[PDB]
Write a protein that binds this DNA or RNA. Sequence first.
DNA 1: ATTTTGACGCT
DNA 2: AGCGTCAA
Length: 430
Amino acid sequence: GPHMATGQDRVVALVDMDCFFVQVEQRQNPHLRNKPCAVVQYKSWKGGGIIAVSYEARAFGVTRSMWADDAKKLCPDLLLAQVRESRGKANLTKYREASVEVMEIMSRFAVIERASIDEAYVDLTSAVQERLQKLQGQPISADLLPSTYIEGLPQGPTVQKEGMRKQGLFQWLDSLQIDNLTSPDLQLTVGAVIVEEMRAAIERETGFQCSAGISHNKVLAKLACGLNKPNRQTLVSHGSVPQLFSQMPIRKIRSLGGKLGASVIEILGIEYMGELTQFTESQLQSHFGEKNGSWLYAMCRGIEHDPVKPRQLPKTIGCSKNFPGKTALATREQVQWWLLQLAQELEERLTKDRNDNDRVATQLVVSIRVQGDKRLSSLRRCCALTRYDAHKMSHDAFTVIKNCNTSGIQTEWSPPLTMLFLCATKFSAS
DNA sequence: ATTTTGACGCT
DNA sequence: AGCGTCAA
Ligand SMILES: Nc1ncnc2c1ncn2[C@H]1C[C@H](O)[C@@H](COP(=O)(O)OP(=O)(O)OP(=O)(O)O)O1
Ligand SMILES: [Ca+2]
């Protein structure tokens, strides 16, 4: 009752760029705009592996992970843009720089947590309070929410997409209580107004479109964001949670898309997030551990307490290359050459990072996969990163991994290496 | 033969 | 530390 927390204390948004790498390439090359297209890495093997797909191409069934030759079977007119290759490997610099463009715009509005290259969480609580004081009881017009969906609406007593959106927005605003500056629903609505403004600024200043979710915590904001892509935003209110969760597969909730979510389904014999409400906190803790159990107990009721972390820059800078099938590195000299290529890219990015962000990495992490091991990483070792020097970093990585080689003749490498990974970590101010 | 990335938890 | 999970 009067002491039961409802997790309505914050306004949190999750901005997710639409088909991001595709949009970067379409901005650069207008011939690709409004076409079925995709972004591919490499080209020799089966036309290259697709890593991003425009919505026009998705309509044909083109997906990520697909080989371009196979995506051409579904979409013969598919256009392609290739990731730049440098030093013998794919180089993602263009997309990292476009990400900085968007993150810097978002940072003008609020503190952001960079979740990935094209996703950021925004804590809008303070900005919403300020805007509510400015509005000073004035109602919120539907014109201020031109691309917003209210999840769950319309309901109760037009066959067009936009018609449904406006019809739902009207019901929401009609019911909204603008008197109460502390009303969580009003706070979310003002949050959505601010996110419309943020998304307009991103599109104006970069050309890039995005989707967004607005709710009371990060998990609901992420879920909301995915409900109406592309180029739309969705408000998930606390009151919308029971219906929304009643048919929501557990795997759709962030962190439950893998083994833990599978175990929740198998152990409890349920399918949907809402069914979790029927277990006590101690029951969930008994099956999934103290932390996961408490998290699930609150999350299935719409309550998540994870903060939006004040962090705009990545905490690590890494470079990796796979060596699949017969191309696995089987000689020592070969291993050293690829470590040098990786270390040269890493040096370049680290030097730029140091100049831009006033920080220095202090640890180098070296990871490898051996041919036959199914695990993503077979071995991980660290050494000091004391100089931004590609020859030194590559020599040091070799030093830390050279004893993994079983071959009695050093010139040969066995078992063959199927992946090399260098990552700079543990930044200190400089 | 998806590849190339980040962030965070466990012991 | 080194390994594993989950996600762009
Ligand atoms: N598995 C992957 N491997 C390599 N790059 C990836 C992978 N997944 C995503 N990316 C890249 C390319 C994407 O443009 C970018 C953002 O990813 P993601 O948000 O999942 O999809 P997306 O932005 O392309 O489409 P959407 O509109 O559905 O968000 O990160
Ligand atoms: Ca995206």
